[PDB]
């Protein structure tokens, strides 16, 4: 029985015998659906994950230069020229610098100067496109009340896993003796990934806006090619210093890693699992089809033996109460007697159960079960079992305006 | 007018709503023989024996198939009964019954074809319920799912009343008054 620990929990209510209920699944959040005359089920989005994305553009945030060369020329001796001037791997700069007798020239004035450097790219970051063919949401479904915090569901009938894509938003999940649930999840309202790039920088991953990505002041290449690619705007990491008569020192700026890290302070963070990316930003409007769902023991007899406590009843973050009971009887499967009475003489049911129609499934003695109850405000009594050996436990619920 | 059948001998009764109890599960590891439960050979119990994958990851020394078996005590909650009508205890009145049975289900009655009745997929017995009857073919309502190390989740089908009813659509509607039955 999940969600009880979860802070951002919802309680979607049913109808009389309806067919559809709308929910919104947020990452880390959880939705407890309680339809009338249906088992209570827990729906939660557990993994948004992207893969096989097409690279769009890579920026360089750490470059190096080697084997630079300059060429000088006196006034009236034409423009300066190197052969490495046309090479794309080489970044260059033209400038005019004062010349005279004091440095080889026949007359005082301006001489031509050119300087080139070989552009290497030590490290780069890559932005990838997020097509619908890359998304794959995974939703977990768990009927309230089973045998016993983690995931080991493949065997459990109360628990089922489903996967959803933008090009396959529909899925069905069988829940054993509880029937089956339906899911039609709109991926458009999921998140506007048509305005987002997936940024990868040295094992660190983010989701960035496309326009912010396009406005990054770094050298860059498009898509990608083996060996050595052609870098545009190399001048973002390579500056020229103060020009002399026959030379001009060229220097590469330091690493721009921390700069970008800071530029990404509020950006969405992505986890990395090999060639797969794993988001934690979740939003999914889903339509739950419920008519194929069913209660297990509508016609069970009640549990006549004694229930006992195993944990002392605790209050959740939402005011509800979780209890864990041990049933010694062997007349299982049977129906669990569980209500809340404000008056022990009449046993008139007040409040409501969250775990709708609790049922012991095993006929072996000393079984365990977790019940969740939604008590009234103030004092009341949690009542479990029947007759003499019934558990009556005083409870109190606090107030409003959080 | 008063077309009336007299006392009838019950042919065969089909259960359409069923329940389980005393459900138990035994599982042995590899090189340690097949699994055994007490009520495995019991006739009131529906059972399932299969082989599940065992290893270190689920509490066993050596890798390989281990023998699992699960047994649940089958019991009937709602059944329909069939009756044979011979042109012997029948009585015409005014102011082919070798092909028909008198089907009765939850206070509603029909006259149905022999073959159709004899070939419906539900648990059944023959004779009459003096209590403790043997239910044949209980697997029609109780199935075993998810072969697993320590257990095997059983599932009981819900009432097949609606399906049986919708099957009897183009069927001869009848009626009864006490220990007899009014025809038409």
């Amino acid at each position, epitope marked *: 029985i999940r969600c009880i620990g979860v802070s951002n929990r919802d309680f979607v209510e049913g109808m009389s015998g309806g067919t559809w209920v709308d929910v919104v699944l947020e990452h880390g959040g959880c939705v407890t659906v309680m339809a009338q005359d249906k088992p209570t089920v827990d729906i939660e989005l557990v993994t948004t994950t992207v893969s096989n994305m097409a690279e769009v553009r890579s920026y360089c945030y750490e470059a190096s230069i080697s084997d630079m060369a300059s060429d000088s020329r006196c006034p009236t001796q034409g423009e300066a020229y190197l052969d490495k001037q046309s090479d794309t791997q080489y970044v260059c700069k033209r400038t005019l610098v004062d010349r005279g007798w004091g440095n080889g020239c026949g007359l005082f004035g301006k001489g031509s100067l050119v300087t080139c450097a070989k552009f290497a790219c030590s490290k780069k970051m890559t932005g990838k496109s997020i097509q619908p063919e890359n998304l794959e949401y995974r939703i977990m479904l768990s009927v309230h009340g089973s045998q016993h915090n983690d*995931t080991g569901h493949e065997t459990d009938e109360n628990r089922a896993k489903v996967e959803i894509t933008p090009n396959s938003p529909r899925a069905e999940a069988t829940l054993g003796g509880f029937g089956s649930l339906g899911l039609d999840c709109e991926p458009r309202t999921g998140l506007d990934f048509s305005d987002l790039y997936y940024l990868t920088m040295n094992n660190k991953h983010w989701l960035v806006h496309k326009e912010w990505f396009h406005d990054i002041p770094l050298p860059w290449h498009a898509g990608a090619d083996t060996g050595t690619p052609h870098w545009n705007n190399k001048e973002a990491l390579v500056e020229f210093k103060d020009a002399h008569a026959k030379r001009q020192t060229v220097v590469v700026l330091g690493s721009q890693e921390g700069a970008v890290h800071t530029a990404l302070a509020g950006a969405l963070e992505a986890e990395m*699992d*090999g060639a797969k990316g794993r988001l934690s930003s979740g939003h999914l409007k889903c339509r739950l089809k419920m008519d194929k769902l069913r209660l297990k023991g509508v016609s069970y007899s009640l549990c006549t033996a004694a229930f006992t406590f195993t944990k002392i009843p605790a209050e959740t973050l939402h005011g509800t109460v979780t209890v864990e009971v041990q049933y010694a009887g062997t007349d299982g499967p049977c129906k669990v007697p569980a209500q809340m009475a404000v008056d022990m003489q009449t046993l008139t049911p007040v409040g409501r159960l969250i775990t709708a129609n609790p049922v012991i499934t095993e006929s072996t003695e000393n079984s365990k079960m977790m019940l969740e109850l939604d008590p009234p405000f103030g004092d009341s009594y949690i009542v479990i079992g029947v007759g003499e050996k019934k558990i009556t436990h005083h409870w109190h619920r606090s107030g409003s305006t959080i | 007018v008063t077309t009336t059948v007299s006392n009838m001998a019950e042919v065969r009764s089909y259960c359409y709503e069923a329940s389980i109890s005393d459900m138990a599960s035994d599982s042995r590891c590899p090189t340690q023989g097949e699994a055994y439960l007490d009520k495995q050979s019991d006739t009131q119990y529906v059972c399932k024996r299969t082989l*599940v*994958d065992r290893g270190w*990851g689920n509490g066993c020394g050596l*890798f390989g198939k281990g023998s699992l078996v699960t047994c649940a005590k089958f019991a009937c909650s709602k059944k329909m009964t069939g009756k044979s009508i011979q042109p012997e205890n029948l009585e015409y009145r005014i102011m082919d019954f070798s092909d028909l049975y008198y089907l009765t289900m939850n206070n509603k009655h029909w006259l149905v074809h022999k073959e159709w009745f004899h070939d419906i997929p539900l648990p059944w017995h023959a004779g009459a319920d003096t209590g403790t009857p043997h239910w044949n073919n209980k697997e029609a309502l109780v199935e075993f799912k998810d*072969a*697993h190390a320590k257990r095997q989740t059983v599932v009981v089908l819900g009432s097949q009343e609606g399906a049986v009813h919708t099957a009897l659509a183009g069927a001869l509607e009848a009626e009864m008054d006490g220990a007899k039955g009014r025809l038409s």
Partner: antibody
Amino acid sequence: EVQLVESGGGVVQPGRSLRLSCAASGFTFSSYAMHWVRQAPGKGLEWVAVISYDGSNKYYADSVKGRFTISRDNSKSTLYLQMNNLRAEDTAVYYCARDHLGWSSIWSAPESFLDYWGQGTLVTVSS
Amino acid sequence: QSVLTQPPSVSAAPGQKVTISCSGSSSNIGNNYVSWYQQLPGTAPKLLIYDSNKRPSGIPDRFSGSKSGTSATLGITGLQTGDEADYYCGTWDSSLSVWVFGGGTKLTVLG
């Protein structure tokens, strides 16, 4: 340009030990999980072991438990398998293999598949 | 006799169509992702299918993958003699906490 190269296998004797190595070149080796998968002569593939992206998670076949020890050096992009107390039925061509995931999650294992494969190394336990 | 069971062998004429199955449990094939691996004679295994029905680049559209219940199928159509090989299904097993391969299936293209 992904490539994996196994090495360190030969004609070893039983009871003793051996240490296989795999050289990776074409990826961020310290970002993907790594597999050891062996194949007896003219037999089927038998998955031996797996280690995660950082080396905090290791899984072994029930046949090679308490005898084999998988490890890795991210610093030089190498995969090590440490087999001690060998047997006859450990005789096989040993392949190392790139996963697709690094196994950085709970959901990693159920999605895992062996992406790129090496070329193998014959390990004979002759006695 | 195997955790994932696939038939020992299968055969078909050139130009025909053949499918290879492997069956498991809810703890492996049922919930996890099935992948297929082709092993040509005297050659390292090669990834054929991933995520139960996806093809790596370079793998022709003749190859297809499907998954239903606790069994998965690989489909090879427009069969060629070059397809003659040993085919393996594989997936992670959650109960045994162990990655598992199928027994293998020798595909022969009758000549």
